[PDB]
Structure formats: structure tokens, C-alpha cells
Amino acid sequence: FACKTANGTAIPIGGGSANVYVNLAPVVNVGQNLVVDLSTQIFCHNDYPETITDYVTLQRGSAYGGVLSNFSGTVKYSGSSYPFPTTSETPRVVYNSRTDKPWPVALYLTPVSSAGGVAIKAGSLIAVLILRQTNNYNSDDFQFVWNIYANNDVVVPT
Ligand SMILES: CCCCCCCO[C@H]1O[C@H](CO)[C@@H](O)[C@H](F)[C@@H]1O
Numbered sequence: 001f002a003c004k005t006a007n008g009t010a011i012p013i014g015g016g017s018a019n020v021y022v023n024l025a026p027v028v029n030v031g032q033n034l035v036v037d038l039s040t041q042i043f044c045h046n047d048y049p050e051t052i053t054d055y056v057t058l059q060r061g062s063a064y065g066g067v068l069s070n071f072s073g074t075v076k077y078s079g080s081s082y083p084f085p086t087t088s089e090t091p092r093v094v095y096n097s098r099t100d101k102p103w104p105v106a107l108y109l110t111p112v113s114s115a116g117g118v119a120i121k122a123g124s125l126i127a128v129l130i131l132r133q134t135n136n137y138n139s140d141d142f143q144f145v146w147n148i149y150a151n152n153d154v155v156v157p158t
Pocket residue numbers: 001002013014045046047048049052053054134135137140141
């Protein structure tokens with residue numbers, strides 16, 4: 001089991017960490033959602049599907065900078081919604097193929113009432129997402145740590 005980003009940055013067998021740089025909608029009004037869809041950015045595969053079934057959860061999601069300060073978040077994991085920053089590990093997603101498959105994570109961030117102006121700064125850390133991988137074969141239990149960075153400023157109009 002290993003993962004890679006849309007730009008080819010990889011986290012190999014045994015886990016580790018990688019930076020993910022995301023393009024964000026430039027404008028988000030109060031009452032609207034800023035969508036951070038990681039399913040088009042993070043892809044994983046099972047290295048031995050003939051014998052092993054891999055299980056993948058979003059173990060934890062933390063918010064930083066402008067996201068922590070200016071937004072109220074939800075995380076959608078494989079069709080279900082949970083608070084973001086996270087309060088519990090999600091249920092497991094099965095990886096049973098060598099074909100690169102999306103990690104089904106998307107952040108839905110709506111501005112808090114105090115938000116106005118530059119709510120997210122270009123180049124800033126916005127989130128840390130921990131992918132936890134286990135299997136039905138041995139004791140393997142690995143963390144794939146994704147550091148999410150904003151590629152651009154996000155403005156909340158006033
Ligand atoms: C002859 C027996 C060969 C055993 C190979 C072990 C491969 O282990 C990697 O791939 C697994 C499947 O994706 C992951 O479950 C695991 F965590 C590890 O990444």
C-alpha cells in the first residue's frame with residue numbers, strides 16, 4: 001500500500017508525510033462553501049490485492065491558519081459528513097486494487113460571521129490530514145500524513 005499526489009509526490013509502503021498544494025476558489029461569501037476536494041489530489045493503491053485487503057480511514061483532520069480562524073468546517077469521507085477539525089476516526093474504506101484510486105476526502109468550509117477580507121493566505125498551511133492504513137493480513141498500521149497548503153489567497157467579501 002502506497003499513495004501519491006496529483007503532481008507525483010509519493011508516500012511509500014510504511015507511510016510518512018507529503019505536502020499537497022491546493023488551488024482554492026478565490027471568493028467565498030458568508031453562507032457559501034469553500035470546497036477542498038482531496039479526492040482529485042490524493043491517490044492510493046493496494047500492492048498485493050491477490051492476498052491482502054487494505055483498510056483506510058481518515059484518522060484525524062486538523063485545521064490551521066485562516067481555516068481554523070475564519071471557517072466552520074465539515075469533512076466528507078466516502079459519502080458521510082463529520083465535524084472538521086475531527087472528533088473521531090472515520091469508518092474504513094477498502095482498497096483491493098493495484099489501480100490508483102482516490103482517497104475520498106473533501107473539506108466543506110463556510111465563513112464564520114466575523115470573517116471578512118483575506119480569510120486564507122497564499123502559501124499557508126490550512127490543514128493536516130492523517131490517513132491511517134491497516135489490513136486483514138498482519139499487524140501493519142501506518143500513518144500517511146498529508147500537509148495541505150493554499151496555493152492562493154481566499155477573500156470573504158464584506
Ligand atoms: C510473500 C508475502 C509478501 C507480503 C508482502 C507485504 C506487502 O506489504 C505492503 O503492501 C500491503 C498490501 O498493499 C499492505 O497491506 C502493507 F501495509 C504494506 O504496505
